[PDB]
Amino acid sequence: SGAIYVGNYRVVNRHLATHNDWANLVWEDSSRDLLVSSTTAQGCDTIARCDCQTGVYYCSSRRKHYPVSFSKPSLIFVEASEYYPARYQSHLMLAVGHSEPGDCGGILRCQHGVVGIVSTGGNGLVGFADVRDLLWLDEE
Ligand SMILES: Cn1cc(N)c(C(=O)NC2CCC2)n1
Ligand SMILES: [Zn+2]
């Protein structure tokens, strides 16, 4: 589990979105495993605006933050998961590291702020759904 809280927006894995998230929907994309809902209170997180390929992610299944190198966001075949079938996921960044399904929502962060959230795992890789292209998260 986990979310990004930026202004009056809550960014979560689409597959972990609650009824309240869907009832307060701003934007969603199945291909990116992302959903954004509205919040009453303003949020503590800042979104990176950058093309960093190094950062740190939070891994709940280890209670640890790990520094990683990661690929630029791309369209990638992902094998079947407990919450999704084998499919292509877009805006996906991969790093060598530990990921289990419940790690989804862990933040990846660079010097510029929040890069993305844990979305995929298996075969020694961790995949992150990029948010840095979502410029509209910064306003309105
Ligand atoms: C976040 N996420 C989605 C997954 N499917 C996995 C995953 O397959 N985890 C295993 C543990 C050895 C890789 N992790
Ligand atoms: Zn950065």
Curated annotation (Swiss-Prot):
Cysteine protease that cleaves viral polyprotein and specific host proteins. It is responsible for the autocatalytic cleavage between the P1 and P2 regions, which is the first cleavage occurring in the polyprotein. Also cleaves the host translation initiation factor EIF4G1, in order to shut down the capped cellular mRNA translation. Inhibits the host nucleus-cytoplasm protein and RNA trafficking by cleaving host members of the nuclear pores. Counteracts stress granule formation probably by antagonizing its assembly or promoting its dissassembly. It catalyses: Selective cleavage of Tyr-|-Gly bond in the picornavirus polyprotein. Zn(2+) 1 binds at residues 50, 52, 110, 112. It comes from the Viruses. It comes from Coxsackievirus A16 (strain G-10). Homodimer. The active site is at 15 (for protease 2a activity), 33 (for protease 2a activity), 104 (for protease 2a activity). This is Protease 2A.
